[PDB]
Ligand binder design. Structure first.
Ligand SMILES: Nc1ncnc2c1ncn2[C@@H]1O[C@H](COS(=O)(=O)NC(=O)[C@@H](N)CO)[C@@H](O)[C@H]1O
Ligand SMILES: Nc1ncnc2c1ncn2[C@@H]1O[C@H](COS(=O)(=O)NC(=O)[C@@H](N)CO)[C@@H](O)[C@H]1O
Ligand SMILES: [Ca+2]
Ligand SMILES: [Ca+2]
Ligand SMILES: [Ca+2]
Ligand SMILES: [Ca+2]
Ligand SMILES: [Ca+2]
Ligand SMILES: [Ca+2]
Lengths: 428, 428
């Protein structure tokens, strides 16, 4: 959600910023609704005042015949309810527009139309030169009998996997290493969160109203008929960021740095036939998430810090990657500025996204009413929120298996993971 | 699913066994449906033969006028389709009865009506005598700021939790310790499984057709409209046992011992107001599961082995418990024989279930068509399946926090968990 006073005072300036993302703001519709709203607001508030006044006249006369007065108040009450419903219908119309508007890109963001207009910022590591024909992680998984997509189709359907034996152990070791790194070295506090969330949570981080189709939704439970319309989380960013919903945080307690390891569930609608083979694009994947709740003036510095935390995962694992500044046309709905880390994937002869690190500015904080106050200044402001993959575990397994594969298909265990695998040097 | 030949040859004997569970088998209805089935089966198979024959007469005459013959075959085809639909309606009626029948209890199971008729088999450890008033895990969680039920209601709703900081780390350490124990010492192979499963999987392990109401169901995805009617798993027993669905296993490859650490999702319908406070009864809980696929003659020995594996978790953690033989009236739908382990919970002044270990006999194997064959004997048989909690992680956290609490609320970390917590001795 953008600042409503910024949409009211300068809508042409906002429309100009949003045009860089390729989003057309309907300024004329917003203006026409806002002008009708002011007419209905005055009518409604006059009816509210007169009804409140005629109700007090009854109580007055009750002490000192209240029948003609009771009829007057019941007609006024009907008129007010009608005026309030008509006003509320217009408010819902404004909201349907307001809540579908993506975040204003920060000036640091380079202008572009799509991913081909993204800017490379840095590169670390040198892609391995192989003495044999590179096998992809799917072929390597079949060789070890460790990645079974056919069993997952039998259990569920497409875009699911069953991992077995040592490769399952390896995927667990990766998550353990990530959580320990962020909690022991990077100052994040660990969290266990619900994997099902309500509508308020989804509106809070921006999945609702515009991206219901990106989620798996659960039918309500019959003994919780009106309070269990839930959706599976698409990322731990959703429950973690909402932990500060309706809160006033003492600025001394900022930054709040949270980490979680969760499964993530996505419908993966559209882009038909893209990443059909393997673990890159699944309906269920594990991800170690980093979330930061910070003071408005520290979010740009927190983005650099949190991106470096995700980069450290790749560096310690010895995985070559490139850091990319996403352009205006390739950013997510909530982001005002994003960096993607793209890991080297030897069988694809390219870098593939393994992390997305974003500064959300005050966009989710406005929706959640998450604020901070200095006891000194004695003034509240909305916080800034940030989220970053540290990392997507399935895609890290893809990168690890492919970069560390041996001639016979054995997987060399990265040095930093060996204490997580009882000092095991190779799988196979 | 029970043996259909056993329901046909001796239904009174089966009804007698099932009566001990408090289940009334409708023998008269099954007999009446079975007798009508034989009438419809003969009519249908005669129509199938005559249609196949009149179709061959056409091809014959095509080489040598085929119009009166084509009309005859189309009328026969309509008659057969009608006879097949009528037969299929009767088959669905038999199935609705057959697939709602619980497993026949094994003779080892003591006869009883409910949990108060269960038999204690053994006891290990001595409940701690405290020098202060015992705090429950909810009060201890508030003291540490580590178990937050209010944040989870905000994120989702009731029967959910948010764990924060060191108590979240502890819950993770418990799962790590369990998976390592079973994989390193007990011969289980680790697995990463889908947390969403299809209808075939749910029918396979017995959740369907009778217990749809015990599950969270997801609405179908619009781009997978006819293949995404899924449910969240209530236990890793569901995806793990189904890994042998439609398989013929070489008996040399038995036992297949599988472990997984997953979240588990349950609607928790009924028993209103039971275990309202705390982690004992949640909509989402973590559990380290053990599953065994064995030869029919080894399942009773495998039950003792798998129960001992769950007991070893409690012993190494220094948690007093009691082993209970469930009576006929307290067993789950699929089980033919179950042992429950009940851990000491100091604030409740009682033992609470932390594990359920079952021999399912060939009940799920029949539904899944999971079989084994000796290359020697050259004869197939249905396998036996077994499942056991090793353990429910949330309830282990309850037991750990309460049994290891200090006077000031600090949590002493069990010795065996200290290598999982970087040698940390206490939380707080
Ligand atoms: N369907 C998918 N299957 C597997 N991995 C995926 C899938 N979708 C995304 N990822 C991985 O998850 C990472 C983070 O996803 S994101 O949508 O870009 N961003 C977020 O979810 C933020 N909360 C930061 O993690 C991606 O960089 C990618 O590595
Ligand atoms: N709703 C719940 N919340 C928390 N823990 C639960 C809940 N339901 C069951 N458990 C725990 O999970 C254990 C196993 O559950 S069970 O239904 O008895 N049996 C199974 O699921 C079998 N697959 C063996 O694990 C129970 O012994 C109990 O310790
Ligand atoms: Ca501070
Ligand atoms: Ca974001
Ligand atoms: Ca992205
Ligand atoms: Ca063998
Ligand atoms: Ca069972
Ligand atoms: Ca039970």
């Amino acid at each position: 959600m953008l600042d409503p006073n910024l949409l009211r005072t300068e809508p042409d300036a906002v429309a100009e910023k949003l045009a860089r993302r390729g989003f057309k703001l309907d300024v004329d519709k917003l203006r026409a609704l806002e002008e009708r709203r002011k007419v209905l607001q005055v009518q409604t508030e006059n009816l509210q005042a007169e009804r409140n006044s005629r109700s007090k006249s009854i109580g007055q006369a009750k002490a000192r015949d209240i029948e003609p007065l009771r009829l007057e108040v019941n007609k006024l009450g009907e008129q007010l309810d009608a005026a309030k419903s008509e006003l509320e219908t217009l408010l819902a119309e404004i909201r349907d527009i307001a809540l579908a508007i993506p975040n204003i890109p920060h000036d640091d963001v380079p202008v572009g139309r799509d991913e081909n207009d993204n800017v490379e910022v840095s590169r670390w590591g040198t892609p391995r030169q192989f003495d044999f024909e590179v096998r992809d992680h799917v072929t390597l998984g079949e060789m070890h009998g460790g990645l079974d997509f056919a069993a997952a189709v039998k259990l569920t359907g497409s875009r699911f996997v069953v991992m077995k034996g040592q490769l399952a152990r390896l995927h667990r070791a990766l998550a353990q290493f990530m959580l320990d790194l962020h909690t022991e070295q990077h100052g994040y506090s660990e969290n266990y969160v619900p994997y099902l969330v309500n509508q308020d949570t989804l509106y809070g981080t921006g999945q609702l109203p515009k991206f219901a189709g990106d989620l798996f939704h659960t039918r309500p439970l019959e003994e919780e008929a009106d309070s269990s319309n839930y959706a599976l989380i698409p990322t731990a960013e959703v429950p973690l960021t909402n932990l500060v919903r309706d809160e006033i945080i003492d600025e001394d307690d900022l930054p709040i740095k949270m980490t979680a390891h969760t499964p993530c569930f996505r419908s993966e609608a559209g882009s038909y036939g893209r990443d059909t083979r393997g673990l890159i694009r699944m309906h269920q994947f594990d991800k170690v998430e980093m979330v930061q709740i910070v003071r408005p003036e520290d979010s740009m510095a927190a983005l650099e810090e949190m991106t470096g935390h995700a980069e450290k995962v790749l560096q310690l694992l010895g995985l070559p990657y490139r850091k990319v500044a996403l352009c205006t046309g390739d950013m997510g709905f909530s982001a005002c500025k994003t960096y993607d880390l793209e890991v080297w994937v030897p069988a694809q002869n390219t870098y593939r996204e393994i992390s997305s690190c974003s500064n959300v500015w005050d966009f989710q904080a406005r929706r959640m009413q998450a604020r901070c106050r200095s006891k000194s200044d004695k003034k509240t402001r909305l916080v800034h929120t940030l989220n970053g993959s540290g990392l997507a575990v399935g895609r890290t397994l893809v990168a690890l298996m492919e970069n560390y594969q041996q001639a016979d298909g054995r997987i060399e265990i990265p040095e930093v993971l060996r204490p997580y695998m009882r000092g095991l040097e190779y799988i196979g």
